[PDB]
Each structure stands twice: as structure tokens, then as C-alpha cells.
A paper describes a structure:
The bacterial flagellar motor is a huge bidirectional rotary nanomachine that drives rotation of the flagellum for bacterial motility. The cytoplasmic C ring of the flagellar motor functions as the switch complex for the rotational direction switching from counterclockwise to clockwise. The basal body is made up of the LP ring, MS ring, C ring, rod and export apparatus. Here, we present two high-resolution cryo-electron microscopy structures of the C ring-containing flagellar basal body–hook complex from Salmonella Typhimurium, which are in the default counterclockwise state and in a constitutively active CheY mutant-induced clockwise state, respectively.
Numbering used by the authors:
A (entry chain D): 1 to 89
B (entry chain U): 3 to 54, 62 to 78, 83 to 136
C (entry chain P): 3 to 21, 32 to 104
D (entry chain E): 4 to 256
E (entry chain J): 37 to 245
F (entry chain O): 3 to 21, 31 to 104
G (entry chain I), H (entry chain H): 36 to 243
I (entry chain G): 36 to 244
The structure:
């Protein structure tokens, strides 16, 4: 009820969002950086060949860590809906 | 029912007026019977008695429900007849006309009450 | 209640320091109409009883007045309900 | 007897109802479409039932241009109060949308302005957070109390009016921008530095950077930055509400 | 007591205000606001059709207001029907359990504000609060509680859209709408975590707590 | 029924242990009250037409009018309830 | 014992007011209409077939699905009531049985358990002890959940097409094109080459 | 057997109530309306022709297409009824046949089989005896499928134009130039030059 | 032969409902608003002047365009109606002729031929004998085609500006600069200096002649 | 003076056209178009909500109509009570200030075009322009004025965007999009100079 | 009132510059009040509709 | 003000009809009282008089009730109408000029004119609800 509880609500929610999005974004960033440094080493420059492995890497990311995200988000939503009638004002 | 309690008094008055009307007409019809006593009822006391029962209990469907199933005062004679008939024409004719008038008044009052209860509902 | 009497004395102290409504009016009108109707009905029952002094003229006139008052109350209720329905139909 | 003078009651209960309902239809949270219309109408009716008997009743007929002037006055007062209150949520929405746009969340607006493709999701997040905070600080009760209080300052009866006062509400349009800049400032600046850092990377071997490495990094950095910045809005939320409220108190009079 | 005609007239007139009692004195407002907000959240403004949600809200309200209705019937309707309590006293007797139910769920701040706006004297205990103060205080408290519940409801459905947009933006697909992708995932979430049982139980507890 | 007697003994056990309003039940009770009033008036008219002694014409008419008033009560309550239900169900969330 | 004919007429004509409510809450109309709306959202165009056509088609589908229940009601309740062999109340009680079975067969256990919890129900026992006022909201909740389960998996192929087209377009280089604009004709092609309408009706019917 | 006059006018007014449903689910209005909406979406102009203009055009096209069926109904059914030659029941039965034939001409056998199998209808010998309750949903489904086919096919030339302009812009290095702004005037020019409106209406009429 | 007063009132009030349909399918309005719907797209601002401003401007322009037709209808048909020298049926027959001529002069022959063939009409001796059922949809079709022609022609100078600005931006190596935002103010410049609105309305009015 | 019921009918009917009066007769279109163009300038098409822009334009319109409202009050509101003039002579007398304002804000070319669109040859004087010719001409003049003000607003933001892009290109960066960098600088320039208050002051001066 | 007499003299200066209850009454005032309330409701509805049409704009 | 002024003529005429019928009923009641001159009013002149100057009463004063327990009481009250004497037709020994034919003709005429006033006022009020209703 108190504004401290509200702002905590937003923080924990958006940290959950950060945890959900961090693996995919970080995998894409690492793949892009690796392809870019390889291009710099080989002196190859086409703006389209960096887009190819990124999709494959990010799609594999759901294969490997997808169940973890799905279990984390469901637990968050379940706990939020269960604690809903105790943060009422 | 509350509807009965509102209309109980006028219904009982109307029924008592009809019964006394029948008694007075019986007195008129038997005017010539030698030895006939003129009978009548005291309207107010009987109206008190009626205004002031246990349906037997029905356990199932086959069980049969309970089956349902006034005091006459002699008129004081005025003139002594030889055949023992105490019916006086004038007295009972006036009483008959009065009872007819009061029956009409009771009908009017009961109809007015029902019509008011109706216009309360109409809409 | 003991606490209720405490509250009464508190409101009396409030009056000391300091030194009807539409629903009330409608309740008063309903009470007046019902009292008139009950008076007419009681007089009619007294006349039907045979008690002396009650004239049929007065009974019939009082029943007439009671009917008119009932009809007035019915009309007021009808309009009031219509006005309430009109107000509740307003789009905000 | 049996008078029940209807015109007196109607004139006593009408104009306060007009002002209360005018505030209701525009005041934040009380004007959200999710509330059924009958609930809003009943709240206005009950508030007027509580308030009106204490006020002096007006006698101007409903069939006169004076009644039209009165109705216009009540509508103006109500909408002015509600809108001045709404300005704070407008400012919060502006700050959130700008943080989100510096995230690169909706890049299609820079190339196709207003092309039916825009999602200010951060703006919505902080808008609903601001609504929750406003509910917590009981701002709506205050709004209702001030709606009642503006009578003593400005009675129902037609009173003369001023000018630059309207400008003030219009000039409040500056606040939406001015306060929005500060909220952002605590994050956009660092994001700016990040973009500057990306520029240093592009000053190296040409191409092979930006649109491939900049976007995910800046998205994650914006996310964690403003996730850490979330505790900061509440003092700024109270500051915004106080600014709107005392501006309203000063200018309505 | 009143004449039978007057009693019938009052009964028929009072039968009119049933929607007002349901909306302004009952648990209906919070449930309907929460349902509307949730429908706004999932991105399907016409999904459970208004009639389905209205029927569910009516059944929920009937299940929630059961003890209050029972107390009214045992204390007011039963003596009135048995000609023990007059028509003008059954209303006063039955308005007390509803008043108590409205009080418990109301809030001090609203009560203080509406006690000040009426220029009424000090209210040392809750037993001195009239209905003219409790009615709008209860209404405002219910509105605020419903909006709080809905606004904490809204957060996950916007979180999903945020992460969807960020993931789409990582790969450079800047011209893909995020709402169209997020809607199936929001439906999947609301299916997985018992979307309705948890919400139903949370609302019911929110009343009985 | 054998299962019916099982249910009777179960309700007896319920009474032993013991030693809930219903709107549908209340509507059923009210409809029953109206229907038995109408049927009683109808049967009284039946017997009075058949010529059975003890029945009076004024009582017949009064009972018929009472049944009419009761049915008008029911019709008005029906109208109010249907209007309230339609206005509640015509609302948008 | 039987109700008077005036009472029967009053009840019969009053009950017709709940016909839309019965059709929506108690029958298969809700699930079909929700699935159709979700499919319209999933097609990429929000109002291609007018609401009127979808509503009529959903009504016909609901009638065809519920025809066995209607036949059972007619055999059990309507026919013996119209021949003046049973009373109105007993006819309604008898006719509530096949509809109760239909509602139970598609009811989630958790929904029924929760709504029995909220109604203070204690020793329930046989599946034939659930009252109508408890069974109905549980059926509505189960129908909403099932409709959402169907919709979110109806969404899948169109998301696949959208993602494939966007990925191909951006990887090829044309990143300034709107992928949805190019994708919509392909969504229509997929829907017409699979016989999406016929298969969707088959799946909706076989869901019961 | 002939209905009394009051019953006849009751039936007439009640049937007049169902007019939009008959127009949408029994005539060619739905297919034309769907194709028009898809075409409007295809030009990149979501609100250029107002809805009322397209609705009026679809209504007039439907009237012209259904003129032979209306003439058959008038000559075979309505005219004898207006001259009191035949009753209303047999007039309606005779008027059903031409409309039924028209709807059967434009339905797909697979959808008819689906709705027959779903409704548990017994084997039906030939097209002569197919209930209207079976034919109407099948015809609606076939109309939906045909409309989607036509719209998807229509979507092709504008897709060609968009792709060619996007490629021309991209091969010039213009990386941040959106192709919609350049494509919309050329879409309008293409539709104008081929006499698009009259050609598309003629194609829709010829398909019926 | 004249209709009764009740039937005349019924027909008049019934025909009053077709006012938007008559305005769209029989007057100039369809060509105007559609062009506006495209012009706001050419300027790069879909917001543009508000929708109601454009609609009312189109309404005023339509009234000015149909002033001669309205005057001819008022003189030939409605004046005897008010001065009792004609019936309602004859007035309806006579007043439509100037409007039919106005519709025919802007009707392309190909569309008219298409709708004849589609109605299986017999050999029409001359324009004067063309049925309204054939003239109405053909007029609407020709109206749409003409509006699209005008809109595409309007789309030209803004395309010129966009192409020039994009070429200038790319020739300087400023490849990452979106040219839409830069070219929008120059489109506004072009519409202001040339007096785009007045010129466009004059062109539309002259086009109808 | 005609019947009271007809007066009520006419009044409630004329109440419907209130958005038409606000848009076509007052200046509301000008402020709303200026706000839309300014929002398009900063690069954020949803930063202030459409509701807030509409309300700000409404308040600006109310102030800038306050002199005309006062003239209406003097010529129509007051004498309608003293009954020196009423009904006809007054409604038109009260509308006269609107005519003066719209003549002031209307260009001659639009009026000339709309006159030759209505074959009104003998329109010689400038205070007897009919409403049918005055209204659409006034609307077109307002559109032109709003577009000119929008371009004037556009100039500094376009300059800032161009400068940011030029410095990015000169510094060696060829891939960094200049919009992301230039957006906060656009905002800090807009706030620091206090763009909003000067914009409203100029709009009020713009009449 | 003293201020009331001030207002009277002000209006004089302005002139210088310029140079029991029955059913019959109950029902009539009852109807007049109903009519005035309906008029107020309709005028407010028109004003609210105009305001919402203005605010539902698109800028 | 405007609506009050528009409906004022018929309302005042109907009130004057009511008062005239009260007077005629008083004449009919006193028809057998010896020494009672019949009274009547000139409807048109009194109607114009009430039109120009508002309705007034002879007395109509009453005890003030500041508290809620004060006993309410009112003294005699009557309209400000001029009660004129009717010219007798033929003499009578008792000394009253109430001729029953005249009384019953005026009673019936006043009855119809009051019903006419009710009809006109009701028509006007509907003629107004028709405009307002929407």
C-alpha cells in the first residue's frame, strides 16, 4: 500500500523483465561483436552477413534457456496474483 | 396473508349481512305458519365473534387434506296473535330494507378498497 | 447503549460549544396519506359496527377524500420514478 | 401543506451536480472509461447530496441565458481542475516515452513519423506506476475537496472572470516538458555517453558496428539503468503533484 | 403502520432502485472494474463478451454477499414477513448489516474527508457515522481498491510486450509490430498460470480479508 | 426407493448432528402462493356453480378479486425484476 | 399439484428474457465466438469477415453441436410436458439433466472446486450433487480457459510466417519494408490452401 | 391450411426483421464486401474510399447479380401469391428453390459433407433434398474461402510494385528511405491505368 | 392521382434518412474528401488538418459546386410544389433530371456500359433514357477513378522533394539520415508558398466543370 | 419573438454544432495544427498525449476569444436582459464580433475565390461578406497560417538535426544514426530557451 | 441590507445614465419542475457530447 | 421565467375556474337557507386583474412555528376576488335569490370550461415534453 511497496513492485517486476530478456539480448550482442571483429580481421564488409548468425543464435537461445524463462515468469505471475489481496488499499 | 387481514372485516360484514338477510326473508316467508317464532341475529356480537383452523398435516401425495364443515335470538313479540305467530310485518320489513342498504354499502366499501389496491399496482 | 449515552452527552457538549429533508418530506406525506386512509377505514368499520353517532354521509365523504389522496400519492410516485429514470439515463 | 417546492430543490441540487460531474468526467482515475457511467453519475449525485444543502441556493431560472452562462462556468471550472491534474501524468508519460525512444525501442518513428507503428511501452509502464502512486497519496480525495472548496473562492452565482489566469493553465504546458527533461536527464545522459562510446568504436575499422552491436547493448543498459532509476520517481511524483496542486490553488482564485 | 396500499406502493417503488443498490452499495463495482481492466490488459477488447463477464460478476457478487444477505433475511425479512416488524422498521433493521459490510471495506482517509465535507461534528467511533457519510466513502474506497488491483494486474502483460520489443530490436527487425507477437504470448501466459482461478480467488480473498 | 430410505436415514443423521436463503426458492414460494390462491378461488367457484350448499356468491367474487390482485402483484414484480436485469445486462464493462 | 395456467404463461414468457444469457454462458457459443475473434486477429486483418457473418455461423455451429442435447431435452421434458403428462416445474427439473451433463463434460475440476469453496459447499460426493448455481460459473471459466488455449495455438502458424518473412527480408537487406504488408497475402494463401475454415470447424466440433 | 391474414402479416414483418442476415448469408454481398475491404487494404490507403461508398457499391452489385434469382422468385412464387393463387406456405416453399439452387451452385462439396456429417443427417440422394439448415452454413463457408482466394490473388500486383521499388531504392544505397511513400502513388497509378474499379467489379460479377 | 398527405409525409421523412447516401453517391462529395484523404498523405502528416475540418470543407465545396443544380431543382420542381401546381410524384420525377444530367456528364462511358450489360438492359436509345439504377453505380465508379487520378497527380511534387532531399543526403555520405523528417518541413514550404489549399480547391471546382 | 417551444428546439439543435463552431469559426484549428506540427518536429509522435494538446489548444482558444466573448456579452448577453434588443436583432448583433474577427484573420484571395465560386458579383463592401463565403475562406486562411507557423517551428529543430549529423560525419562516424543523439539535445534546447511560453506568446500575438 | 440599499442607489444611477395549496397549483409546479429538469439534462448531454467529440480528436 | 410566463395565463384561468366553482357550490349548498343572496364573480375582469397584479388574499395570516413542537394554526383566508350579487329572477318569501336553474347551468358551464383549461394546459405541457424528449 505504501509508496515504498509500490516502487518495490515496479523494481522487482522490471528486474524480472531484465532477467527474461538478458540471455537473448546478450547472446545476440556477443554474436554480433564476434562477427564484427572477424570482419575487421578479414577486411570484409557487408552489412547483411552479420544478420545471418544472429537469428540462429537467438533462436537456439530459446531452445536452451526457454524452459527456465517460462518457469520464472509463471512463478512471478502466480506469486503476484496470490499476493494481490494482501497489498490492497 | 396480509391481503386477507385488510379485507377480512368487510368480507365478514358482507357475509353476516347476507346471512341476516336470509334469516329476515325466512321470517317474511313463514309469516303465516302458526306457531312459528321470529328469529334474528345480533349483528355486532356475531361480527365480533367471527372477526376474533388447524389444517391436518399431509405427509405425502396420497394423504388426503383436512375436510372443512351463528346463534339465533328470538324476536320479542309486539302483538299477541291467536295462532302463536310472532312475526310482525312492519318491523321485519324495515329491518329487511335496512339490511339491503347495509349490504349495498358493504359492497361499495369493499369494491373501493379493491379498486384502490388495484390502481396502486397499475402502471 | 452506555457508549450511546456517552455519545448523546458528547453531542450535548457540542451544542453547548456551538452556542427537514426531501426523504423526510416524502415520509411525512406517506404517513399523512396512510393516516387519512386509516381514519376513513376506522370510521367505516365503526359505522358497520352499529355504534351511534356515525353518519353514512361522513363515512362516504371520508372514503372519497381518502381515495383522492391515494390517487395523488400514486401520481407523485409515478412522476418521481420517471424523473429518477431520466436522471439515471444521463450519459457522463 | 403538501407543498414540496420543486424548483427550490432543483436549483439547489443542479449546479453543484453540474460542477461535480464536470470534474468527474475529466479528473484522472475518476474519468477512466473502465468505470461504468452509472457509477460516476451516482458518485456525483451522492457528493452533491452531501454538499448542496449547506450552500446558498440560487434562483436563476433554468429557462434563461443566465442558466447557460452558469452551466458554462461550472463546466469550465471542472474541466480546468481535471486537466491541470492530468498535466502531471502527461509529464510522466513524456519522460517515459523519451527514455523508451532513446532505448531504440521504436525506431520506425524516425523514418516514418506517425505511421501507425509506435509502442511507448515504457511510457505506459511509468504512466500506470504514476497512477498507482497517485492512488497511494490519495490525490483524488484532495481533488474532490478542492472542487468543494472552489465554491468559497468562486460561488455558483455568476461572478466576473480574469485573463492571464487562463494562460497560466496553458503555460502549465511548459511543465510537462520541463519536469520530463529532469526525470530523463537521470539516465538519458548516461545513455548519451554510451552512444558516444559506440561512436568511438565506429571511429575504428569502418562499418561493422552500429545496428549490429549497439542496439542490444544499449537496450540492456537502458533496461537495467532505469530499473535502478525506478526508486527515483516517487519523490519526483510528489513534487509533480505538489506543483500541480499549488498552481491550481493560486490560479483558480 | 402504513396502509396496505401505501406499503404496496413503497415496495413497488423500492423495487426500481435495484441496479443502484447493485452498483453503489455492493461488491459489483470492484469486480466489474477489475474485469474491464484485465480485458484491456490482454489486448482483446471484445474477448469475453460483455454479457459473459457481467454474468460471471453477478455470480461472484452473489457468492460474496451471501452472509450479508443471510443476516438481512434472518434479522429483517423473516420478522417482517411474519408480521412481527413493521414495513418502516424492516428497512432500518436490514440497512445495518449492509452498512457494516460497506464500513469494513472502506478507508479512514475517505471517511475523514467526507466527515469534513458535511461539516458534521466529531465522530469518536464508527457507530456515529451515518449512511450519508459511509456511502460515498465506501464508493471511493471501492474505486481505489479496484484500480489498485487492476494496475498491479496490468504489469506482467506490459512486461511481456517490453521484452518482446527488446528481443525484436536486438536482431534489427525494427519494422515488426510488437503487439501482434505479444498477444499470443499474453494469451499463453493467462492460460498457463490458471489465469481465472487465481484471479477469482484473489478477488474473493480481497473481499474477505 | 431403497436409495430413498438411505437418503431418509442420512437426513436423520443430519438432524442428529445439527442438534441458507435461496432467491430461486423464494420465487418458487411466491409463485406457489399466487397459484394456490388462484386455485382455491377457482375451486370455490367450481363448487358454487355445481350447486353445493354452503358457498356464497359474495365470497366467490371476493376470492376471485383477491386472486386478481395477487396476480397483479406478481406481474408488477416481474416487470420490475426484468427491467432491472435488462439494465444490468445492457451495461458494458 | 400443478401451477395455474396464468402462472405458467407468466413464467414461460419471462424466461425468454434469459435466452441470450443461456446461449452465451451455458452453450458452446462463447468458445466458438472467442476462437473466431482470435482467428480474425491472427489473420493480420481485424475485420475481414463482418461480425454478422461470424455471429450467424457461430449460432449455426452451436445449434449443430447441441442438437443431441436438444433432442434429449425434447424427449425428456418438452414432449411429455406439452402432452400434459408432467407439470412445468418437474419438466424443467427433468430437462435440466442433459444440459447439466453437457456442462459437466467440459468443466475443469479446479473451477468447480474453487466455486464450491466460495459457496461454502462441504460434503459434495457424487458428480450428481453439484447445484446449477455452482456448476454454471465453473463451466463459464472452463470455457474461457479452453477458448484461450485454442486461440494461442491458432496464432502459431501466422507468427511463423511473419517471422520467416521478416527474417528473410531483413537478412536479404531490405530492412525498410514493412514485413506485415508483404506477409498478409501469404497468410491468406496459407489459410485458403489448408482449407482453414473447414478444418477449423472440424476442430471446434471435435473439441467436444 | 392457408394462414389467416393476421398470422400472414406477423410472418411477413418477422421475416422483414431478418433482412440483413439474408443479405449477408444468402446473397453475394459478403464476398464482394470482403474483396472490397481486402483491396482497400492492398492499395496502402486504409480509409480512402469511405465505408458507405463501398457498402453502396456492394449492395448495387449484389442486386444486379441476384436479379435473375429475384425474377425467378417473382415469376414462380410471389406473383401467384399476390394474385391469391397460392397460399403463403407454398409460396415460400416455391421461392426457396431458386435461391437454394443459386446457393448450391456456389458451394464446395467438402463443406457440405462436413456440415452433413456434423449434423448426423442420413444419406441424401442428389442435390434435390438438402435442408436449408445444412446448406446455409456450408454456403457461408464457401463464400468466405472464395473471397479470401480472390483477395489473396488481387494482392499480387501491388506486391510486385512494392518489391521492385524497394529493390530499386536499395540498389542505389538509399538505406533509410522507406518504400511505402514512393510505392503509394505508383499503386494508385497502376490501379488507375488498368481501369481497376470496373475491371474488378466485372471480375466479381463474372465469378457468380 | 396525388398521394394523400399521410403518405406524402411518410415518403418525405423516409427519404430524409438517405441524405448521407445521396450526398456520397450523387453529389461531388465523394471526389473531394477522397482527394483530401490522399493529400494529407502526400504532405507526410497523416494527422494534418483534423478529420472534421476536412469533412466540413468538403461539404462547403460540395454545396458551392452543386449550387447550379440545387437552383435548377428549386426552380423547376420544388417551386410548383410549394405553390401547389404539382404533386409529390411529379416533383420527384421532374427534380431528378438536372441531377441526372450532372451525374451523366461526369460518368465514364465504359462503366455505364458495364452496368448496362450487367443489368441485361435493352438498347438504350440515348443518354436521356438511361435508368437511375444503371447511372448511380457507374457514376460512383467513375468518381472513384477520377479521384484516384487527381490524387496520384497531386502526389508528384512531394515525391520530387523527397527524391531531391534523399539524393542530397546520400551524395554527402550522410547515409544514416532518414530523409522523411528533413523533407517534411520543405513539403510544408511548398504547400505554403504556392498557396496549395486555394489552388487545389480551385482545381477541383474547375475539374467538375 | 416566436414561440418558446420553437426557441427551445432551435437552441438545442444549435447546441449540436458546437464542435463545428469551435473548429470553423474560432482559431482552434490553428493551435491544434501548430501543436501537431511541433510534436512532429521533436521526433516523438506520442510524447504529450493528444488529450493534453487538445485541452491546451482549448484554453488558448478561450483566452484568445475572450475579447470577442466580451463584445458578445456587451452586445448580446446584456441587452437581451434589458429587452432593448432581443431574438433576431441581437443574435446577429452578437455574431457581428465573430464576423469582425474572421474578416481580420482571413486573406483576400480565399474570399475572392469563394465569392467567384458563388457568383456573388455585387459584393463590393468588406463588412457585408456573407457567412457562406466567409467561413471556408477563413478555414483555408487558418490552414495556411498554421502551416507557416509549423514551418517556422520546424526551422530550428531541422538546423539542430543537420548540425548533429554534420558533426557525426566530420568526426568520422558513418553508421551512427543522428536522430538518437539529437533528440535529447532538441529537448534541452526546447526547455532551456523555454520554447513553450514564447510559443504561446507568439500565438497570442499571431491573433 | 445596507449593501442592498447600496445596490438600489446603484440601479437608480444606472436608470439616470440610461435616460392551502390545491391540486391545481401542485400539479402545475410539479410539471414545470419536470420540464425544467428535462431541459437541463438535455442541454448538459449536448454539451458533454460536444466536449467528448472535441477531445476524441486526433490533433 | 419564459416557461413560467408562457403557461401563466391558462394556469391562472384554471385557478379562477376552481374558485368560481367553489363559489357556485357554496351557492348550491345554501339554496334552501332563508336570507342568502347568491354570489358570483365576473370571470373576465377578475382574470385580467389577476393577470396584471398577482394573486392576493384577504388575510391568510398564521401562527409562526420556530420550534418543532409549536402547535400549527391558521386564521380565516379567502381570495381577493370581488364577490358580486346575482340579480334575482323571481321573489321569494324566505328571502334568498338562489335560483336553481341558474346555479346548475353555471355549474355545468364552469365544469366544461375547467375541463377545457385542463386539456389546453396538458396539451401545452406535452407540446413541450415532445421538444425536450430525445
Amino acid at each position: 500500500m505504501t509508496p515504498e511497496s509500490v516502487m518495490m513492485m515496479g523494481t522487482e517486476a522490471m528486474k524480472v523483465a531484465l532477467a527474461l530478456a538478458a540471455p537473448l539480448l546478450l547472446v545476440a550482442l556477443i554474436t554480433g561483436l564476434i562477427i564484427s571483429i572477424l570482419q575487421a580481421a578479414t577486411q570484409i564488409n557487408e552489412m547483411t552477413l552479420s544478420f545471418i548468425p544472429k537469428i540462429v543464435a537467438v533462436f537456439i537461445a530459446i531452445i536452451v534457456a526457454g524452459p527456465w524463462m517460462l518457469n520464472l515468469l509463471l512463478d512471478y505471475v502466480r506469486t503476484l496474483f496470490s499476493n494481490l489481496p494482501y497489498i490492497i488499499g | 396473508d396480509r391481503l386477507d387481514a385488510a379485507l377480512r372485516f368487510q368480507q365478514e360484514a358482507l357475509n353476516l349481512r347476507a346471512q341476516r338477510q336470509e334469516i329476515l326473508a325466512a321470517n317474511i316467508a313463514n309469516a303465516d305458519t302458526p306457531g312459528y317464532q321470529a328469529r334474528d341475529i345480533d349483528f355486532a356480537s356475531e361480527l365480533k365473534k367471527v372477526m376474533v383452523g388447524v389444517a391436518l398435516t399431509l405427509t405425502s401425495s396420497h394423504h388426503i387434506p383436512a375436510q372443512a364443515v351463528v346463534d339465533l335470538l328470538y324476536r320479542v313479540p309486539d302483538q299477541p296473535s291467536l295462532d302463536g305467530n310472532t312475526v310482525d310485518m312492519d318491523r321485519e320489513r324495515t329491518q329487511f330494507a335496512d339490511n339491503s342498504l347495509k349490504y349495498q354499502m358493504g359492497l361499495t366499501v369493499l369494491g373501493s378498497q379493491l379498486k384502490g389496491m388495484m390502481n396502486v399496482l397499475q402502471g | 447503549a452506555i457508549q450511546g449515552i456517552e455519545g448523546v452527552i458528547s453531542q450535548l457538549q457540542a451544542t453547548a460549544m456551538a452556542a427537514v429533508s426531501f426523504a423526510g418530506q416524502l415520509h411525512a406525506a406517506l404517513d399523512r396519506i396512510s393516516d387519512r386512509q386509516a381514519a376513513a377505514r376506522v370510521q367505516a368499520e365503526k359505522f358497520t359496527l352499529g355504534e351511534p353517532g356515525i353518519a353514512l354521509n361522513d363515512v362516504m365523504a371520508d372514503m372519497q377524500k381518502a381515495s383522492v389522496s391515494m390517487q395523488m400519492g400514486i401520481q407523485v410516485r409515478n412522476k418521481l420514478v420517471a424523473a429518477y429514470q431520466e436522471v439515471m439515463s444521463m450519459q457522463v | 401543506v403538501t407543498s414540496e417546492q420543486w424548483l427550490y430543490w432543483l436549483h439547489l441540487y443542479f449546479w453543484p451536480l453540474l460542477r461535480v460531474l464536470a470534474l468527474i468526467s475529466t479528473a484522472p482515475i475518476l474519468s477512466e472509461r473502465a468505470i461504468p457511467k452509472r457509477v460516476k453519475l451516482g458518485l456525483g449525485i451522492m457528493i452533491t447530496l452531501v454538499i448542496a444543502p449547506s450552500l446558498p441556493a440560487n434562483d436563476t431560472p433554468l429557462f434563461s441565458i443566465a442558466a447557460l452562462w452558469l452551466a458554462m462556468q461550472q463546466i469550465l471550472i471542472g474541466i480546468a481542475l481535471g486537466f491541470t491534474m492530468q498535466f502531471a501524468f502527461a509529464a510522466v508519460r513524456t519522460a517515459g516515452e523519451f527514455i523508451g525512444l532513446q532505448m531504440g525501442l521504436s525506431f520506425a518513428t524516425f523514418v516514418d513519423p506517425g505511421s501507425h507503428l509506435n509502442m511507448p511501452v515504457l511510457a505506459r509502464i511509468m504512466d500506470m506506476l504514476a497512477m498507482l502512486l497517485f492512488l497511494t497519496f490519495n490525490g483524488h480525495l484532495w481533488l474532490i475537496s478542492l472542487l468543494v472548496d472552489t465554491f468559497h473562492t468562486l460561488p455558483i452565482g455568476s461572478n466576473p472572470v480574469n485573463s492571464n489566469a487562463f494562460m497560466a493553465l496553458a503555460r502549465a504546458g511548459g511543465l510537462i516538458f520541463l519536469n520530463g527533461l529532469m526525470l530523463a536527464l537521470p539516465v538519458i545522459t548516461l545513455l548519451l555517453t554510451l552512444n558516444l562510446a559506440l561512436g568511438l568504436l565506429n571511429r575504428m575499422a569502418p562499418q561493422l558496428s552500429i545496428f549490429v552491436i549497439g542496439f542490444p547493448l544499449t537496450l540492456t543498459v537502458g533496461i537495467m539503468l532505469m530499473a535502478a532509476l525506478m526508486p527515483l520517481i516517487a519523490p519526483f511524483c510528489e513534487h509533480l503533484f505538489s506543483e500541480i496542486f499549488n498552481l491550481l490553488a493560486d490560479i483558480v482564485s | 403502520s402504513w396502509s396496505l396500499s401505501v406499503q404496496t406502493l413503497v415496495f413497488i417503488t423500492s423495487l426500481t432502485f435495484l441496479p443502484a443498490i447493485l452498483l453503489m452499495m455492493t461488491s459489483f463495482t470492484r469486480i466489474i472494474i477489475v474485469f474491464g481492466l484485465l480485458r484491456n490488459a490482454l489486448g482483446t477488447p471484445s474477448a469475453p463478451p460483455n454479457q459473459v463477464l457481467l454474468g460471471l460478476a453477478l455470480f461472484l457478487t452473489f457468492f460474496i454477499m451471501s452472509p450479508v444477505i443471510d443476516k438481512i433475511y434472518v434479522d429483517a425479512y423473516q420478522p417482517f414477513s411474519e408480521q412481527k416488524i413493521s414495513m418502516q422498521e424492516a428497512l432500518d433493521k436490514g440497512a445495518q448489516p449492509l452498512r457494516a459490510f460497506m464500513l469494513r471495506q472502506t478507508r479512514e482517509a475517505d471517511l475523514a474527508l467526507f466527515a469534513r465535507l458535511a461539516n458534521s461534528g466529531p465522530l469518536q467511533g464508527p457507530e456515529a457515522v451515518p449512511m450519508r457519510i459511509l456511502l460515498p466513502a465506501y464508493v471511493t474506497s471501492e474505486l481505489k481498491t479496484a484500480f489498485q488491483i487492476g494496475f498491479t494486474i496490468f504489469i506482467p502483460f506490459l512486461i511481456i510486450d517490453l521484452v518482446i520489443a527488446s528481443v525484436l530490436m536486438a536482431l534489427g527487425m525494427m519494422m515488426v509490430p510488437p503487439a501482434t507477437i505479444a498477444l499470443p504470448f499474453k494469451l499463453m501466459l493467462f492460460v498457463l498460470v490458471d489465469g481465472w482461478q487465481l484471479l477469482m480467488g484473489s478477488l474473493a480473498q480481497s473481499f474477505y480479508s
